[PDB]
């Protein structure tokens, strides 16, 4: 994990110089992203269970994946899917608040594809649930907050 502020302050410290105008400019527009990223992180942190419930209720439920033979049967596999989607939402919120997808790569998307292929987890259904998570977040967040969460959920989708 490196966020946007550290990824600019650290090379200036290795150089021993101040933040030059390009890096301080790209930091400035991060600082006026700012309050909306914190507002989106506040909205997600209070209503995370509701977001995951709506994500499952429109992409995974009422089909054959929760019936016997499916990969969300029995309750243990449902609970595993539910905490997986909670991991995806929490680390996408971390990467959105940091404005940097590095925490998505060294905590989430590392061996995950091989884990799901070994386990038999349907990766297309996971990607479809993440696509529904974006639509759930679009109806609950603000406009550009939903777009940034969409970027950081597409990073998980492209890694999967």
């Amino acid at each position: 994990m490196k966020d946007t502020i550290t990824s600019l302050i650290n090379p200036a410290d290795e150089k021993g110089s101040y933040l030059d105008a390009a890096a301080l400019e790209q930091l400035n527009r991060y600082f006026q992203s700012g309050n909306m990223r914190v507002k989106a992180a506040k909205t997600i942190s209070s209503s995370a269970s509701s977001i995951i419930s709506k994500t499952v209720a429109k992409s995974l439920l009422y089909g054959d994946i929760t019936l016997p033979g499916g990969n969300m049967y029995p309750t243990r596999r449902y609970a595993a899917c539910l905490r997986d989607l909670t991991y995806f939402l929490r680390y996408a919120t971390y990467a959105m608040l940091a404005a940097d997808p590095s925490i998505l790569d060294e905590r989430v998307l590392q061996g995950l594809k091989e884990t799901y292929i070994t386990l038999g987890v349907p990766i297309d259904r996971v990607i479809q649930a993440l696509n529904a998570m974006k639509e759930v977040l679009t109806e609950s967040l603000d406009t550009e907050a939903s777009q940034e969460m969409a970027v950081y959920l597409d990073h998980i989708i492209a890694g999967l």
Partner: protein
């Protein structure tokens, strides 16, 4: 985990939970005055040298018994170098939202280095106090309201 956002995310990740209201409160106070932070870091970068010589003059008035005031210009240049380096470390903390650029770069092992070099610590007391007073005259009322915790933190480490 140098910046305040990365520390907030690291505290929330270690506890396997989302962002608590204390951490939202901390990031609210960091991002509300983030235009002032950019402006203050740009101003401290912009007239570093004006601050350094104007504080060196007041410091040599208030303390003439320094290794800088011994005639040879190269200890004087190393002192001016250190004043500029510590202003740079203050600007990093204004940008980061915490004094961790000042602790990790500037104050960790600083006392052992300066006692071995022979630079006295009351001399650095008064040097960073004069540097704070000059930068207070430079920045603003409210950009200095950001910088003055970090200048006080730097001063208190001597």
């Amino acid at each position: 985990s140098m910046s305040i956002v990365a520390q907030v995310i690291a505290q929330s990740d270690a506890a396997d939970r989302f962002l608590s209201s204390a951490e939202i409160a901390k990031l609210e106070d960091f991002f509300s005055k983030g235009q002032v932070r950019i402006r203050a870091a740009q101003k401290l970068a912009e007239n570093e040298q004006k601050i350094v010589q104007e504080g060196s003059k007041r410091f040599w008035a208030k303390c003439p018994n320094t290794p800088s005031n011994k005639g040879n210009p190269q200890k004087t240049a190393l002192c001016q170098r250190d004043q500029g380096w510590y202003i740079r470390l203050v600007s990093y903390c204004i940008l980061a939202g915490n004094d961790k650029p000042l602790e990790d770069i500037g104050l960790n092992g600083m006392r052992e280095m300066y006692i071995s070099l022979g630079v006295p610590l009351p001399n650095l007391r008064v040097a960073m106090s004069c540097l704070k007073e000059v930068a207070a005259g430079i920045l603003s009322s409210e950009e200095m309201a950001l910088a003055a915790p970090y200048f006080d933190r730097l001063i208190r480490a001597f």
